[PDB]
Design a protein around this ligand. Sequence first.
Ligand SMILES: O=c1ccn([C@@H]2O[C@H](COP(=O)(O)OP(=O)(O)O[C@H]3O[C@H](CO)[C@@H](O)[C@H](O)[C@H]3O)[C@@H](O)[C@H]2O)c(=O)[nH]1
Ligand code: VO4
Ligand SMILES: [Mg+2]
Length: 608
Amino acid sequence: NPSNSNLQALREELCTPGLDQGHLFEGWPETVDECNERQIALLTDLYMFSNMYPGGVAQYIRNGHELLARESEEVDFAALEMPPLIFEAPSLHRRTAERTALENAGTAMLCKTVFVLVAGGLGERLGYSSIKVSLPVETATNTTYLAYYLRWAQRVGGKEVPFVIMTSDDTHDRTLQLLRELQLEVPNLHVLKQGQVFCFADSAAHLALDETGKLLRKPHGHGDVHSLIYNATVKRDVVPDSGDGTATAQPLVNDWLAAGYESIVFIQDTNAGATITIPISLALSAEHSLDMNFTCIPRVPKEPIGLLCRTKKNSGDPWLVANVEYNVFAEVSRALNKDGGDEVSDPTGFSPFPGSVNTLVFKLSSYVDRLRESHGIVPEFINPKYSDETRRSFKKPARIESLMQDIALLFSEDDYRVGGTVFERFSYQPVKNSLEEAAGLVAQGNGAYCAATGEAAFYELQRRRLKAIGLPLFYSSQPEVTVAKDAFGVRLFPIIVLDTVCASSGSLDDLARVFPTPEKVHIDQHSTLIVEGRVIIESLELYGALTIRGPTDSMALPHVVRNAVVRNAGWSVHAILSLCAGRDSRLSEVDRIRGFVLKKTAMAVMDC
Ligand SMILES: O=c1ccn([C@@H]2O[C@H](COP(=O)(O)OP(=O)(O)O[C@H]3O[C@H](CO)[C@@H](O)[C@H](O)[C@H]3O)[C@@H](O)[C@H]2O)c(=O)[nH]1
Ligand code: VO4
Ligand SMILES: [Mg+2]
């Protein structure tokens, strides 16, 4: 694509005042025709940046200057108050008429929903050297986060459900390999790989080089997902169009709208609670006519989650409903008095504003409109890490970032209704922290959000949902294992995991289909129940571990369990001892990041 003539022109352009990238060509020959292979490759990297990044590398540097200047100024909002459109979600463990009505409405709307999963991030800070969607939701079945989301989506939207996964250079190949290994068949899955962007070595936006003399690249944030969707195409065969030419440029958003889809949902890589909040969020988006709906929890004052606020940046700006990231809120909170009056704390102990967990629910028509106007471009920022409190130095090269929730400020209050739904904190179950930082956080009285608490919260979630339909689970709240040098404990048992064929959407009505007479099902607090396929359990007495397998097709007739009595040694859990020699150690990173291992001593199986 790039000729040698254009390569010299870009080189000269980047050496002009305001760009000042002469350090990249130190000791280079005057003409392009005299250049080595590596030099040609650098100019090619730079020239092809125009293709991937708006306006190319020249515009990237100019944006850097604008953002670096803005980052040097103390942030200030003209006005900051509660968003007008806030709706309290009912409890996930109470089968009220409201809960039943909202679940059944949202489950119908799931048939007309597009699903988007952002999975470009590493989180090596976890102590996990692989991709986060390969993490197990729980080690009882070892079901990955990738398989969890995909199987729920196919169950609620059918096998042909439209699904997008955003990957990065760090996660793409491993994501494709995991899809192949799980033998997942998703005909309308689109994997879109975000590109990394150049880095700034200093506050003057001088482009950074690595150890081998090539331009350092770093992530542009989860904001890239909108532009990737805007530029994505699909062919036209069984779709409304059926041309005899493969040169089809139908936008993926056009096929979705043409097929009858009315909603789009964005989720993150390690939050299993999204399958619980999404149906309620869709029902309330329809009842209250919300174009964009932020999923929120009550926030503790120092949580690393954003806040949903009604904002005005400057005195003349119209009201905007947008997310304010935790860092910005801290800077604003810590400030001299004589500025507004919405900072006083709440009696309970929660932030004045709802905390955004970044499960984003959109009306598809409104989303497409703003996507087409903006080309998926969202406002950017930069947050360099300086070496000393005096700044004027970068400990590590900085890069421009973007947030996928920052698409909310393209939604004017004049044309669009933007609101938030507030759920229980228990419904937010991310795996973000390693055991070390989880020990540090718990000492301050904060949430661990580690692999141990993520797995434990998943088992507790199943038990709360099942007790909501009348299953009589009597178990202690006392922990069964301590992790991170006895800093905190979790409990796991009783373990009850139902697959998507058994539990269907996970609605309380769907769960009542598995236990039609729950008063005659008695699962001891130390037991383990794994149910796969089309199973109905009418009466059971379980003291130990039991797997029940039914037909793998939902339309098949169901295996019905009656008057079963199963007793065995079952399972246990024990901590990974500090004196872990590691000689002939089957302990993997998966075990080590949660601090315990399940011992699967006995297991009964009911087949057919
Ligand atoms: O280049 C990137 C960066 C991030 N991600 C994905 O973004 C999600 C969240 O990233 P993470 O580092 O876990 O969270 P933050 O970006 O720090 O915070 C987000 O998630 C919080 C809730 O977990 C919200 O409160 C914040 O507002 C929101 O910005 C994950 O699925 C990542 O894989 C990508 O796909 N690509
Ligand atoms: O690549 V960093 O998010 O450690 O600056
Ligand atoms: Mg990096």
